[PDB]
Structures are given as C-alpha cells and as structure tokens.
Amino acid sequence: ASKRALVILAKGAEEMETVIPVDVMRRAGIKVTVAGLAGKDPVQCSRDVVICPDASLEDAKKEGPYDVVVLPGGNLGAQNLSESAAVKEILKEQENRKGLIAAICAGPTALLAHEIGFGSKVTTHPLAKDKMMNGGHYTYSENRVEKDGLILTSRGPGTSFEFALAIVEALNGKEVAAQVKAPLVLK
Amino acid sequence: ASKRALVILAKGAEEMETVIPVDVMRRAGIKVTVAGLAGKDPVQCSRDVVICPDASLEDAKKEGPYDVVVLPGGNLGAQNLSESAAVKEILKEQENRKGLIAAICAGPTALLAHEIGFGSKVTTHPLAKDKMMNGGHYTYSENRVEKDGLILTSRGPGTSFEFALAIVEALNGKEVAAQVKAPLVLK
C-alpha cells in the first residue's frame, strides 16, 4: 500500500515549491493529488507558470485521508490558503488525526491563520518571519528544514529538495529518501 | 530592453528542470516563452505535472530571435526534442547567430541529434553520458554546470538552480544573478 499526499494549489503559489515536492514525492512512490483550491481549472502560479490540477480541492477533500497535506509558498498563494475555510477544515482534521502537515516559504503562515500546531518550532522564508511570529504562537528556527512532530516546515525555493526529501523520509523512510535523492544530482 | 528566452516543452520533460529555469529567468526580468513542441495544448511532464504552454513552438519560432534557447531534460522529453525538425532548425539558427543554447540532464542529447556545438565541453545527467558521447563529438565534464562558449549544459534536477543562474549571469550579468539568487535561500 502506498502513502498519499494532498498538495493544495492556489493562484500565486510558488511553482518551484509546488513542482519539486510533487515530483520528488512521485519518485518516492507516493500517490500525489495536486488539488486546485479554486476548482479544477488551470492555476497561474507566482512566476506565471500555469499548472493543471489533478482535481479540485472540493473533490480531493472527499477522497482522503492523506498521509501528508502540503502547502506550497509564494506570498499570494499562501494568502489564498490562509483565507480558505476548506483549507482550515482540512488542516484541523489532519492535525486531529495525527497526520503530517508540510509547509514551505510563506506556506507556514497559513498554519497561523488556521490556528494549527501552535507551540511548534517552525521556519519560514526570511521575509515571512514577522507574519508567522505575530502573537508569538510558534518558536522560530533558521534551519533549512524544521520538523516538530507532525509540523514540517522549510524556507524557500532553494530548500525545496530538502523539504521534499524530508516528507519522503517521514512517510517512506530513510532508505527510500536516499534512493530517490541519488539520481537528482544534489550537493 | 529585456533579454528573451525560449523554453521548449515536450511531453516527458522533467518538470523541475522546466519550471526552475522559467521561474528563475522571470525573476531576472527575462521575457520567457514556454513553447509547446506539439502545440499549445497542455503538456504532461515526466512526473505527471501538467503545464500549459504560453504558445505553440510553431508560433513562438516566428517571434524570435531569442537570446537563449533552453532544452529541459527528462529522458522522454529529450527524445522528443531530438526527433523534431523544428527543434533542429531553431538550434542550428541559434548557433549560426551566436546565441546561447542551454540544455540540462538528458537535454544535451538533443544537441547531438541535431549536430549542434560539436567539440564543446559538455555535461549531462550521469545516465545520459553514453548517449551524448556516442561518436566522441563532445568532451565530457562532471561539473555541475559547464559552459563552453555558447553551449551551456548541466546535470540534473538538483543542478537546475545553478543552471538557471548561469543562464541569468550569461544574459543579464553577475550582479543580477546574485540579486536573484539571494531570496531563493540556496546553499
């Protein structure tokens, strides 16, 4: 049986932070659903790459549970995630059921919006720190990837491989992460 | 005036190797055209990410010249590039006019197919070396990014940031590459 990932794709998502996790997770044999927040229409990412989701979020949320819920960054994508009642519900259920939640760059600020994982040690993009830390509900880290229990965070486009491989390790183990990593030609 | 890039997107392209250069180049203020080899329909990449091109290659090739032509990798994407007469023409014109050609992973094997840049020092994905070296028409390198004149090559998903930043440096200079790099949170 394979593990399953839900990647929530909103307008303004950082496309590198979307595609790197999707691709790496699929290399790991994870069943990944790219779910469009706004429906199954194509999504215009932050740098104008247009990605066709696998499903609407509306549909995908009925086909859970997922072993991980992934929140890409990009300032405007994260804002859309933060404003969504559907995202709130998905994250609250995931946290209740002790499933992994993984967010990168500005993505963790949706955790704040939805009151998820308070008390966790987290990282974000440097420019998103102040937003994440408003109210002091998290403890900040400058590590490239941070994991505190079921809350997995990371910093930016350039940490996306490390983030994705951390998700793979959490779901499928160290050996699978190492096997997936080698063909990537990472430093 | 801005520099212009043509990114040729075929079925089976490695989506990370497509999106990272597009996004990084747009961050650099380059005007990037994502051109679908087979037309302007959505393209199913190697790990099933579906990208909507900006234009068909047929249309985009009429709107040149481009300061760089970029060939993503992915074994099957590169095969499609290698089999295309339109790609052959584009690359031969680009080489004739002394414009940059940038190829990553399996992508450089399309240079071999189209008889482009013979004698150049090149790199590829490790698994693509034998194909690239058939006939001894290039000199092989294990550097993460290799540049020999107007032939710029790189190795894999994990070298895509370095590849993209090398394109930015070649087109817009070292200072712009450094400015674009810093917000990425690269090591």
Swiss-Prot record, chains A, B:
SUPFAM superfamilies xrefs: Class I glutamine amidotransferase-like
Effect annotated for changing L165P: In PARK7; strongly decreases enzymatic activity; reduces protein stability and leads to increased degradation; ubiquitinated by PRKN leading to its recognition by HDAC6 and targeting to aggresome where is degraded; interferes with homodimerization; abolishes interaction with PIAS2; reduced localization in lipid rafts; almost abolished detoxification activity on methylglyocal-adducted CoA
Effect noted on mutating A178T: No effect on detoxification activity on methylglyocal-adducted CoA
Membrane topology listed for this record: Lipid-anchor
UniProt subcellular location: Cell membrane; Cytoplasm; Nucleus; Membrane raft
InterPro entries with a match to the protein in the record: Class_I_gatase-like, DJ-1, DJ-1/PfpI, Prot/Nucl_acid_deglycase
Major localisation: membrane
Effect upon mutating C45A: Reduces protein stability. No effect on oxidation
Impact when changing A103T: In PARK7; loss of protection against metal cytotoxicity; decreased detoxification activity on methylglyocal-adducted CoA
In-chain residues carrying the UniProt-annotated modification N6-succinyllysine: K181
Site (described: Cleavage): D148, G149
Phenotypic consequence of E17Q: Strongly decreases enzymatic activity
Consequence of substituting V50A: Disrupts dimer formation and strongly reduces ability to eliminate hydrogen peroxide
Modified residues (Phosphotyrosine): Y66
Expressed in which tissues: Highly expressed in pancreas, kidney, skeletal muscle, liver, testis and heart. Detected at slightly lower levels in placenta and brain (at protein level). Detected in astrocytes, Sertoli cells, spermatogonia, spermatids and spermatozoa. Expressed by pancreatic islets at higher levels than surrounding exocrine tissues.
Lipid-attached positions, S-palmitoyl cysteine: C45, C52, C105
Name this protein carries in UniProt: Parkinson disease protein 7
Source organism of this protein record: Homo sapiens (Human)
Top-level taxonomy: Eukaryota, Metazoa, Chordata, Craniata, Vertebrata
